[PDB]
Scaffold this active site. Structure first.
Site, mmCIF file in Angstrom:
data_model
loop_
_atom_site.group_PDB
_atom_site.id
_atom_site.type_symbol
_atom_site.label_atom_id
_atom_site.label_comp_id
_atom_site.label_asym_id
_atom_site.label_seq_id
_atom_site.Cartn_x
_atom_site.Cartn_y
_atom_site.Cartn_z
ATOM 1 C CB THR A 115 20.682 28.395 44.484
ATOM 2 O OG1 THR A 115 22.051 27.982 44.570
ATOM 3 C CG2 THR A 115 20.567 29.552 43.494
ATOM 4 C CB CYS A 170 28.071 32.983 37.832
ATOM 5 S SG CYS A 170 28.464 34.719 37.502
ATOM 6 C CG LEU A 197 21.910 39.871 32.261
ATOM 7 C CD1 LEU A 197 20.553 40.064 31.602
ATOM 8 C CD2 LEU A 197 22.983 40.654 31.516
ATOM 9 C CD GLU A 209 18.786 36.232 26.763
ATOM 10 O OE1 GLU A 209 19.713 36.469 27.572
ATOM 11 O OE2 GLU A 209 17.589 36.507 26.994
ATOM 12 C CB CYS A 268 9.756 30.496 49.670
ATOM 13 S SG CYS A 268 9.332 31.761 48.462
#
EC number: 2.1.1.-
Length: 271
Positions: free
Chosen positions: A18, A57, A79, A108, A253
């Site tokens: 990130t 994470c 996930l 969720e 990007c």
């Protein structure tokens, strides 16, 4: 899936995928990624023994930094099985008396009380139908003085860009198609009101917004330079098609962050 061995060729040793934060202009990529994590965690007013939830994470870089520097209990959600496995292994290799666990679980389904929440570039991949539900759940599992640091990409519409002197080019539309039609982030981003308005509807106050637009352009430049330098090994681990696609994503990007077409920000969120 893309192998961890491919990502290892251009990420720094924290495995953080990130936006970094070049707090000092001469930081290495690793120093800037730790600075980004510290920048977010400092806004949470952590005390040793608190429990920190990391939503999305990744390979565990932020949680590892959270335990090592801030001495907090941590729960990481992901996930992605590759993300979970590396997060699990790294947290277990930490020498700590604190709880440090990764879970293959979506937010969720997570319903435990935590003291603080952090999330780096997970929100911008949620469905818009989940924006409000995410903040309602986050609000609910935090204590009365809880805090959340939401680090998220967001996009701008034609009219706001025009007011800033920016127009979308045909090249920008072709790149937008390449994002959604391939396996990369940046497609169907939330707007800034999607973040702010839903968070406020759930009861959060936006204490602080810190934009990192040009830090991401530099981060993406660095990943692309690392990947180019390891091109032969990258092609061996995957393929020339995947290498060129990644290089197109990274440089494309970075160009569009520099042009101001999208942004990335840390939202300090209080009760």
């Amino acid at each position: 899936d893309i192998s961890d061995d491919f990502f290892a060729l251009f990420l720094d040793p924290t495995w953080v995928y990130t936006c970094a934060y070049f707090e000092r202009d001469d930081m290495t990529l690793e120093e800037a990624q730790l600075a980004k994590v510290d920048l977010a965690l400092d806004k949470l007013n952590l005390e040793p023994g608190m429990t920190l939830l990391d939503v999305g994470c990744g390979w565990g870089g932020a949680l590892v930094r959270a335990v090592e520097k801030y001495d907090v209990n941590v729960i990481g959600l992901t996930l992605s099985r590759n993300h979970y496995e590396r997060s699990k292994d790294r947290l277990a290799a930490i020498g700590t008396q604190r709880r440090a666990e990764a879970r293959l679980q979506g937010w969720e389904e997570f319903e435990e009380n935590v003291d603080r929440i952090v999330s780096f570039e997970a929100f911008d991949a949620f469905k818009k139908e989940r924006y409000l539900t995410f903040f309602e759940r986050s609000y609910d599992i935090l204590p009365d003085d809880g805090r959340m640091l939401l680090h998220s990409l967001f996009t701008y519409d034609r009219r706001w860009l025009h007011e800033q002197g920016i127009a979308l080019t045909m090249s920008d539309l072709r790149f937008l198609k390449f994002l959604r039609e391939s396996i990369f982030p940046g497609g169907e981003l939330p707007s800034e009101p999607d973040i702010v308005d839903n968070a406020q509807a759930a009861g959060f106050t936006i204490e602080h917004v810190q934009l990192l637009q040009q830090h991401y352009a530099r981060t993406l430049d660095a990943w692309a330079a690392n990947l180019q330098a390891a091109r032969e090994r990258a092609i061996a681990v995957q393929s020339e098609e995947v290498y060129n696609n990644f290089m197109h994503y990274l440089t494309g990007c970075a160009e569009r962050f520099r042009r101001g077409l999208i942004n990335v920000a840390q939202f300090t969120m209080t009760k």
